[PDB]
Design a protein around this ligand. Sequence first.
Ligand code: HEM
Ligand SMILES: c1ccc2c3c([nH]c2c1)CNCC3
Length: 394
Amino acid sequence: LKVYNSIFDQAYEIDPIPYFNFLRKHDPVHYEESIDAYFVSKYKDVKYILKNNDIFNTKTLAKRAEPVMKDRVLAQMSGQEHKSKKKAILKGMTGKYLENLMPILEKRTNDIINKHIEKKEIDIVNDFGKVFAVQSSMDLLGINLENYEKIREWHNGIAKFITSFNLNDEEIKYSLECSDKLENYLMPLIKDRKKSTKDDLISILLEYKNDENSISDTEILALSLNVLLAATEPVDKTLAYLFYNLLKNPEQFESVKNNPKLIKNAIIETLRYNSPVQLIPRQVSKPFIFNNTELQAGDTVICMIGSANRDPEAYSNPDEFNIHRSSDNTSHSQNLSFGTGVHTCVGASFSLIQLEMVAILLLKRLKNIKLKTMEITEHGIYTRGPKSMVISFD
Ligand code: HEM
Ligand SMILES: c1ccc2c3c([nH]c2c1)CNCC3
């Protein structure tokens, strides 16, 4: 082997930060033969890749996502189609749809809190976040909460297919079974929704028109599964990371309590510091070179969002959690936790709003919060988060 530091070394998933530092400095466009892809670790190169959709396109997501999405996902689209359908999805989490949704998500949040408040402790990952995330996503889409437990199971199986690189044949078949079950559950709901429209995102997709042409039913399912997958996975992770980092920095935690407005900045810093979506793949459409590393048409580049967001060329003291960062005082950049360019996260504004509502309610109702999980264990290299994050309260 010419190089000996691999993304797939056991040590990387345990703690990738030393890998970030090594790759940015000594191998910014790093080849991994096991998946025939290059890993891009620097902020400047990640930004360039994401801002140039013509040179680095999203056709990678066709083999990595479509087998379980059952049809085309928003990432695969381009031009006016991508723009119009992205705008249709944003409609479901803005305007009056957002005004109606937020009280519901408040209800979801207080219902979970009410289930745990007498135990004087709660696992932000396993008690709150995993439950809230999938319920919030079902509410956004318009899915009734009766079967949220199975929805979570099937979601986990589909997400594993998207976030994994070396799945065995029994893992693949299970993920596909999960995909079939979710489709078998959702297709009827789309059918009933179109004969009796409501004010949810599934109804938006059914009523969308592009020159009198309606979206096919399987595409509505794929877009619905895209939103379910996309909206669930990062929520539990980011909420856990947020309270963990605050509790591990008590002065910053006290600052958030005194000035509640700082919560938004704490969420943004959390997303930068512990990027829950770690990797964004792209396919190279033509010969290209970064530094002196040559890329050919058809090659795969994988942006390392966490590494970029800790690039010393973009942030001063990048490996320190600091909610008071700002371009008004040092080095500070716009983080890439939501991506950038054409395919930047449609859910970004909603996510920030939803996460602020939950954080404020947790701080309001759980008094004198204390950390019990003194040391987190993180899992995942594509999406990443703590396994557990238990807090205690009065
Ligand atoms: C903390 C929460 C979230 C984070 C960190 C996050 C992160 C990201 C990133 C990094 C991308 C770019 C992917 C790429 O360029 O290939 C993306 C895209 C996307 N996200 Fe999110 N996301 C979050 C929440 C959400 C939510 C709540 C929704 C929907 C309700 C959503 C739906 C989407 C969609 C549809 C895209 C594709 C955008 C496009 O192709 O134009 N995400 N997200
Ligand atoms: C794989 C697993 C999860 C995700 C999410 C996005 N892409 C993914 C790929 C973008 N939206 C946020 C969630």
